[model samples]
Target: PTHLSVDTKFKTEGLCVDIPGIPKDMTYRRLISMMGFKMNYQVNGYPNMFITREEAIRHVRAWIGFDVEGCHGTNLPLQLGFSTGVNLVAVPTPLMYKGLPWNVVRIKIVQMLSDTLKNLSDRVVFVLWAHGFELTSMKYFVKIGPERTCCLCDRRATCFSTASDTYACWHHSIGFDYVYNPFMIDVQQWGFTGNLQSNHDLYCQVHGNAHVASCDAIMTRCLAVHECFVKRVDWTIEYPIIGDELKINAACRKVQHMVVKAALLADKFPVLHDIGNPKAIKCVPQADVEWKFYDAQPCSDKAYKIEELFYSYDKFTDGVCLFWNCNVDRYPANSIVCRFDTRVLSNLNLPGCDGGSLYVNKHAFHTPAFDKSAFVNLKQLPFFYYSDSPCESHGIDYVPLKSATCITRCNLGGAVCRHHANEYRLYLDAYNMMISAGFSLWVYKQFDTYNLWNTFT
Candidate 1:
């Protein structure tokens, strides 16, 4: 599978490479010809003649600054921009385009910041600022989403979305049936123009799901308000005449002053403040180039042992007990939180009413005076059950739970409910015992009133 082969011998730090396996004496041109490869004679810091092996070696070494005594020297300059203190990173450039979605723009910026945070040492800090032009242009288009549709009702037009801000129909105006004379048009005017154009061709008017296309316009209104940031896009210029004058260093002190002022206060606050005198501070230009940006061995790449630490944090049972105790005083003694009164309460072998003694066939709990609105107020129940009402307009059988205190407290109100009160007190004593014994609320309530309802007829 291998086509060409070479062997290299090290002399000092320099390498002597031989083509086609072994002999050390082969010219660069002869080697290239034998290998069926042509040499690209690009001009650089080396000689124009590259026929011999020694000449080729000399040129490459000289160009790379490897011809020194140890071959450790390099032509590339080594410089550092920061060392210890506060280093301001002033990359006030636009990372997101005008037409890109806010999510896309936000993630890109977040990713850049996250990556930078991971790479920089603990001593380094970054202060990011949004530029003025970017802010101005971004303010205008913040209400728009990345999604777009063309004026011509032929599917979703990619051209209308991000190509240009103009909303004109490219097909009809440029090469279609319309006569193209000098005509004035507003920026918002789009799709087919003129009296001859058909309104039926409009997507919003013709499409069955016109609301779907209209929703993008509504979605664009929602904008993320990040603290201290300005965003914008580039401004295009058409007619310009600076003549043949190439103004390289033409200083504009007034414009420069304005630019500096705008840049500093663009985010409505000072993004980067001068900590020390500009002239006194000495910094390296290529501090980042001195080392690799990312870590070769990240923390996630290394394996570590797990250790357990003890604390006084609340357990699951503790949370459940705290929740239960907090709402214990909320409910009245005789109030029904929920009710499934489809059958007689006595059929469940529960209590009777104080109204009168009932015949075996007649249920005393089903009295006409037993107000349906006798149900407990929502505020009296645990806050968790406040929104658990099952009654709705859709279905009559909307009750999801049966009352636990129905026949006990709700049926026999006032003094007659003392027996059931004793029963509830004993139930709570057992509940607290289970909680202290490390039984979770889930296990404790698995056979309680709420869960037991499913087994009931």
Candidate 2:
């Protein structure tokens, strides 16, 4: 006769790892994402399942052993599931229900019985079926907990729909334009490097601005440069100094922003909704931050000035996605290039100011909070390092050759990899989130305390 609210208690079992050297705050979310899980789904009914500390250790063990079971890779097969870009092993998840509390079971039964009568036409049953398909079935399909953003934009079908046209103008307006598809085009090369060291770890010199040649980008460049050049460099520099001061040149921080600009094909790439505060997309008059490569002292005052690709138009106004670029030349392959045809929006009465293209790798995703160590290994290089330069060789011996140069590009040949993996850590109390009503269960794993200043350099 009336709607009734019922809650259920379900006992869950799982495992997790706390490897000594790994940071204590490192939760299962990052590890799962790194291992290639779509990392999107949320727990459905009785949402208090995945994070039970009592079963945390058990969940950890099961996760590490996921591959050993040999199951389907991701949730892409579900009726509503779509391709999430990457695939993770689908071993028997530790997130399983053992038994239900009696009170919980009664509540569930009452709700089910009530639903059967209202929709009796569907021939529904009132009893707890004890069905094994709760996790995979459609009835229980209200995405439980918090949901992650979709990696690809399938809403094109809806957004581009027109009043007069039968199908959206996607193929002609967007697809063929190749502007909005940032994952389809190539950005320019940033820099070249050999086995250089910084901070006691291996380092490579990215030329031009500092960002153009990211350490990771430089690492990729070392692989791209000739083998001879790969051999010439020494990686024995101490923490403050990576390579021999006389030979290696660290990419300047100011220029690094431009390099990042060069790598970015446009202002935005279409896929999932933006996280936290989704900024209204708009055009930027100019890249306000220093986009030039300010070559100067290694760790001096001038080198550090930099601004992110996107920033708010004003403290009060919505943020704009400012896409800047430098090297329009020497781009790598497998790069995603995107150009926007705002015509679709204009036609549909949703157009904004202007539309442009963006060039990027498909690996980019918005982590709900922030994570400093979000590493993107675009290609699966067999060895520690790879090289495409004329001075080619493998391992530590290959020297930097006369013709050797390295560019940290997400889309170059050799191994198809993303250009960058940015880590942004948001400080949220997961313990508090767990007890809060309608808490985002999905990205909870991403929340952690971050000492902002040094986390994302």
Candidate 3:
């Protein structure tokens, strides 16, 4: 039995829509009334106001932009922002309280940037600076007051007027305030006293996995957000005090999905490793040492079970090899660059080493070592930048990828890596080569002689 039905129609644009069988004349109210039969009112001429499936799809496409096939990933951490919290950080603002996850946030970010990139060319880029705030505490609490204004400026700063009229502090219009500084607890504090009291009424009503919510529940949330964006639910003494709140709120939520692509060309460099060790005669101190140095270890050309490493930690291998040649050493001084092609290396085996290998920014890579001392304060990765520059941020965070030369022989890009963003053909070539080679690039070996705690120190 078909649970759903669809029909195709041609819009004015060259776009084709897989429209629902529902007609174009149904009112949302009538559609709600058709519970059991769920009559689609478009055919009945009930004044349809809802967006069509085609329109919905078009919106999605516009949001996600052009799609291409064969984006198979080769490195670990398939999802981006899992490590270093660079792109993964969330900002806590009244706007974010509108209710949406990072996924939707990411989408909106992209759309916003795309629009900017198109109209302004590449010179004027929009930068997104976000910080995570708690929904339980930071969301919808303060009300702006009337007549009595904030000391900041002259926009108006009323939180509540009459018993029935309470407005968001962000929209307080009684005071001559140009902008409520984000840290203004005085500006934000007393206005939200009523909101705090009302929190208990709505608290825990929908507490669970947001992903598993019913369609109705999800739709209700979405509508609430939309209404909030329009300031439809606000009770204001001034002419829609919510308008200011609405603008800021919408921008906040909108920024979450705003795709801010700080495009660094594929010209990033890797670390330098040619500084010869003066104390070493043969790279190793002991000639009779039974163990091998992992930096020089050679991988045997043999297929290894790639999946088994997910839970196992002992599969890491270590050995020794001659670092006699430095002919192709072009990596930058002290950085790591990932190369998608691995055809030159003869070995093809990837046994897990328990060392953290995760995908960041949609490509497989290693997690950067955070300064242990800095982790104690545990502040949100500061999203501020120096004069809106995408090349760098004020935050002290960076990723650690092995130099292209350092891991070139080891095939650090893994079995399925591709170098360029638009290289679909290279992806397939790597996949076929990985399959034909009958092995994986997932093995590693590091020797720790005598387990000295800080011998290098």
Candidate 4:
């Protein structure tokens, strides 16, 4: 087989949004073409369907605001299906943004998918998968004014061997030690919100002079900060101001390279081979992608249907078999015994077609045990499960709390409901303890406990 290709059929040719002084070029056409091409080869198929032109206009209006037409919720589900091939919901999303530094694209495309589904109930089994990194620049885009350099400080970044891959600003070179894992552990005070002096103070607190770090090290640190901060920010609450103020610096090639790296990491781990590039996966044969496995079927013999033997074989396939056309060794010692210990399976050497017992360590599959303490009104909550029938929407089974005795909404509202009296007493004790700690009586009296509960809950 060959890689999927695109042409004018999928191009955003005639599309135009009437905003003043803006060029109506194929912004989204290029973005979608790239996205679809990547998905076709990387994700194994194409989206054979498209969201209605009307629905697409609705999203465009939402992004650009009242200036554009069709600015209202359509109250329709983004259609997606799985059949002979996976089908994805299509939205006629464009690279919708306005302002200076015309090259910079905004991330309204990602937001539109979520915003349109506001009226959706939990019963809706929907998933929107995005596959690219160009939009990641949204995290760095500033709203108020123009920007230059990496952070809030003023000073051109230092360079050495390569023009782009160099460092400085914080007026110090960044180090690998600054590249941390707890999301934004590298970001000065967990974000770029503080003033330049405050950022320097934080930097000094974390390290010494930033001017001495290597280009690679500084690049890593900046990216770790930018990426982690961008991802964690509650984008649903606010959209950044889109313009040249948000663009990466001309001298910061390190930051630019990191942006591309972050995008690749955003997709599947180890990265899937792109069919467009022949040399993508050097080791895996191209023919391997076409290979398929046959279903595991029982032999047609009376002896094979013995009660004990038949049940045992069935149990093995049900619990342990992960692939069809693969046989398993039935040594009792290797059998999936309990939730723990599997040396018999792990130690086995595959000698032939009956290969070996697929020694899946059961520990990896264990889900967290349900705990009542995890959520308030756990019993009253509705249970949502995948529907067996493809056409039917996933249903929610509601279970009401009958004789439950912890806390009720009524108790929190200052009502003396008998069942939740204990909870109310606990709340009062905590309240009095806080007041005793130093809060004024007036402050305590005006505190909205119900609102706080709602926020936290």
Candidate 5:
């Protein structure tokens, strides 16, 4: 915390705004923790993806504004400026004002930031300009991607697997204890208006310690105070910025990876592998896919009825089964290419050879990525038993969660979801995989991709 000399003007200008949500108790002084983290695209990887007012005010934990500065471009977060109203705490807080003369290691700074927040009131609404940009930096040294991280299940699951075991269950990617699933505000979206440069300049003009991160943190404070309390703005309202931990990403990766591993074994590794990179290919739609209660069958069983069984026993070379063989062999240069961009069975408006419980909201699957304009709505799309027609991507109806567990997550509540979608993906992929390398009349005359189409026969 920075030291300050008491001036005659202190009584008039220091810490004026009554904290909206915090109780009017002097014992709970300066609860809001305005924290800044390293901000740079080169440093982190990318932006993330999630507002409110009077009801927002009721939910506001702390109106703290903060900023962080790296060593110019290294983005190591050499300076940490946490300013909320009266308290001004910089990472160095250089009593001599030497400015970061002390050894500034990454872990220590990270710990310091974590510890700082840990010490703050549990309800503090940590503020950042664009909170995701700064908050996402927690993974810089941590390096756990959203896919792997989501598998940990609940918040405590992440904590037990991550570091300590004291944090709110929805505590985001922050590995340390801060707020107890507390509120956080990204002032850029929460309140502040105008372009990045102008807002920074205007905030600095309004209040400053001159060209330092502490100055910026104080600016964020002013921004939040003005927008939330003074302007009394009413935003559309939103929930907390919980960064990626639903369950679908893990489900998607599980299904895709299993297919790749099995195909590698049966098709002889890269020679007849599914695509440019089997490991990287994603089977589930980027978004969600709805389904039709359509029939799952072929026009004629004899024509497409084809199945190959090498490591396992199966019967009937149905059209659906033949496709698996083509997936593995691709011989005579023939294959049923799996696609997610459009409805596979165009004329029928049903996926070809895919019926039974197979279903999907293809409209949601092919539509562009998440959100457009200033709107966010995905709850309308129902999870489906089918994400893609390919066994590699198609979800199984036998699985749980209203047959949508294999596709992604249900928009329902957490209690209604399960993380075991991985289990289902592996089972389906392994089963479908056996059909890839067995015996097939179509490949009996011609050498398959591996030329072992009938090796087991």
Candidate 6:
């Protein structure tokens, strides 16, 4: 099926776009939508409107520099405030009514964005503080998402694989062309620090806490138009809002998939070990742990809350390792910085009395005594930073890697056993039930005792 049917001439910039198949008269925005051809460069027609703050708005006719407020964890966007630097449209003013269906609030929002952007192109550019931040949530309940990649940094910058009818990628399929396009600038790019409030404080605009949904839109406009350097956007180096396609931590998805499966298997085929100890009581302990804020230097705060300690097993080897998710306030939909672990020393295979073991971020500690109070909190659970003056958000790397170090004070005498007799009892029960008879329990002399609990089975 061919849709590049129009034969129209367009002025070309050398090395920019050389597809004669794409007619110059056709909108790159529309072509990709109707025809579905992927573009990796900012095409000829859509040039930068941001030459100067004063004249930029003059160029942008239907500009909706907006802000969205979505509570309930990630992206349940409830209210929206949009404007063309004048007639600001803040909806449900301050807040939306209670118990309103997400679809009702979101359909209106999507409608608003669409109607304003309806019969327009090139002249309109939508916006939000770190537009990625809100659009991520904007994608939540309103029924949206589909996957496609446009690589032009000056324009849209997103890439995702897999397409589902039920859900689509936000950047891949916004109603118009895309939400992450050039005109619809993400202020986090170009240069805005921290968040709207903190960035609002950057120039000391003192706009009274920058929290009002409408004012957040106003400050978003203020920063995009007034604060940051406004000029022709050129894709010289790389981008900020997203990571490289390869660096999206694609493996994290696989790892998480295995995690859920492991949970299911644990439920279906239970295992048991030893539990004859009189002092056998496990508690998730609460204690102050070492801490580091993202993009900050030299952790001075020694008393951070006990975040969390969850456990998982190797997908292939079935060896167990313990860890948890962190820095979530900064990365809601993570494409960077994941953690990995393995059973470095399995006390089972080579064991007389494998007390247990200790694990820091990536290092293993020897002889984590079994007498240690194996700590976990029944409740112990717990993002981005910084002034650009001394840092450029101090981004670690473009690669999504599991950096090893002390995310937690992983230094408790962690010589714990993996064999829970209560859990294993179910296995024995299942076996007895299958045999339709009683089974004898045997105590083996071959001990899987290690400083850390790592039973291969």
Best by TM-score: 5
Clashes of 3: 58
Candidate 2 stretches with Cα past 4 Å from truth are 1-242, 245-249, 252-258, 263-265, 268-457
Model 2 residue 215 distance off true place after TM-score fit, in angstroms: 32
lDDT, candidate 2, equals 0.20
Candidate 6 residue-wise lDDT, 132-250, digit = tens? 33443433322212222343223222212223222222322343222332244445434433556676545333344435466676556545533322222221222122112222223
- Kindly indicate the candidate among 4 and 6 with the higher lDDT: 6
What value of lDDT does candidate 3 attain over all alpha carbons? 0.22
**What's the lDDT for candidate 6?**
0.30
TM-score of each: 0.13, 0.13, 0.16, 0.15, 0.27, 0.26
Query: lDDT per prediction?
Result: 0.20, 0.20, 0.22, 0.22, 0.31, 0.30
Which ten-residue region of model 2 has the weakest summed lDDT? 178-187
Error of 3 at 32 (Å): 9.8
TM-score (C-alpha, index-matched) for candidate 5: 0.27
Which segments of candidate 4 are over 4 A away from where they belong?
1-29, 32-457
Supply the TM-score for candidate 6. 0.26
Give the candidate order by descending TM-score. 5, 6, 3, 4, 1, 2
| TM-score of structure candidate 2 | 0.13
Q: Give the 10-residue window scoring lowest on summed lDDT in candidate 1.
A: 221-230
* Candidate with the larger lDDT of 2 and 5: 5
Error of 6 at 248 (Å): 52
**What is the number of backbone collisions in each predicted candidate, taken in the order shown?**
11, 80, 58, 5, 18, 20
